């Protein structure tokens, strides 16, 4: 399966941004548990959400996860300068994971 | 608190064989998984397969089941991943990465990744 992800999108402080996340073989489902994590420079990632919807410890509530039509899909409500980073998105396939490609958010 | 250290740069022979490691601390080792996963340049991410350290089970991308071999060490909660028959498609970014799977499935904690080369003795 390819995961498909925008290639980068650019946002203003203080607004809200929506990544999205694609499944070649049909729509993303709760059953694909949907992971996003972020990647910041220096090679530092953090895992954000799993589950579609369910965000790990410490991280901040601006960031909430669900499904969008066919697609799952990362809010990030009032971004900050610090979110600038690349954010993957991830979805289980019965067995195995897939990441998309990638989504570098620039912050304005 | 929690903290996963893997080891440093690597720079291997082709056709040989590399043993990572992932150093965790701050947390019960046994209560989370520990997956695997490979970056290298315009390739995205590559997810290799996890591990139970309660138990030692695995769950293996296909791509990567002749590839990778996963263990743990409880003693030193430890988690390694050896990577054989190496090639230059194995020189990547190498990161271990801890997993809630309860209720759900989600990464938290990610270690600073360890690089591999594969180089050819000249
Ligand atoms: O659902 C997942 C999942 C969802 C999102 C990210 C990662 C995983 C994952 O890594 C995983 C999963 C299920 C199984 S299960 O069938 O064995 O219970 C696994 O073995 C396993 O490794
Ligand atoms: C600790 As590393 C930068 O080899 O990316
Ligand atoms: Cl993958
Ligand atoms: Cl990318
Ligand atoms: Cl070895
Ligand atoms: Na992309
Ligand atoms: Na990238």
């Known amino acids: 399966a390819v995961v498909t992800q925008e290639s980068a999108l650019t946002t203003s402080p203080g607004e809200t941004v929506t990544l999205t996340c694609r499944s070649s073989?049909?729509?993303?489902?709760?059953?694909?548990?949907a992971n996003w994590v972020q990647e910041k420079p220096d090679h530092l990632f953090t895992g954000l959400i799993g589950?579609?919807?369910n965000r790990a410890p410490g991280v901040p509530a601006r960031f909430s996860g669900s499904l969008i039509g066919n697609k799952a899909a990362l809010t990030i409500t009032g971004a900050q300068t610090e979110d600038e980073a690349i954010y993957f998105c991830?979805?289980?396939?019965?067995?195995?994971?897939?990441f998309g490609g990638g989504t570098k958010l620039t912050v304005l | 608190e929690v903290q996963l250290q893997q080891s440093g740069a690597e720079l291997v022979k082709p056709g040989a064989s590399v043993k990572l490691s992932c150093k965790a601390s701050?947390?019960?080792?046994?209560?989370?998984?520990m997956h695997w996963v490979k970056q290298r340049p315009g390739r995205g991410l590559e997810w290799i397969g996890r591990?139970?350290?309660?138990?030692?089970?695995?769950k293996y991308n296909e791509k990567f089941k002749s590839k990778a071999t996963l263990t743990v060490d409880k003693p030193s909660s430890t988690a390694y991943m050896q990577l054989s028959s190496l090639t230059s498609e194995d020189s990547a970014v190498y990161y271990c990465?801890?997993?809630?799977?309860?209720?759900?499935?989600?990464?938290?904690?990610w270690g600073q990744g360890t690089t591999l080369t594969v180089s050819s003795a000249a």
């Open positions: 990465a801890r997993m809630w799977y309860y209720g759900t499935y989600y990464f938290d904690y």
């Open positions: 701050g947390y019960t080792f046994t209560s989370y998984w």
């Open positions: 591990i139970d350290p309660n138990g030692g089970g695995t």
């Open positions: 073989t049909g729509a993303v489902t709760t059953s694909n548990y």
């Open positions: 589950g579609t919807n």
């Open positions: 991830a979805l289980w396939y019965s067995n195995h994971l897939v």
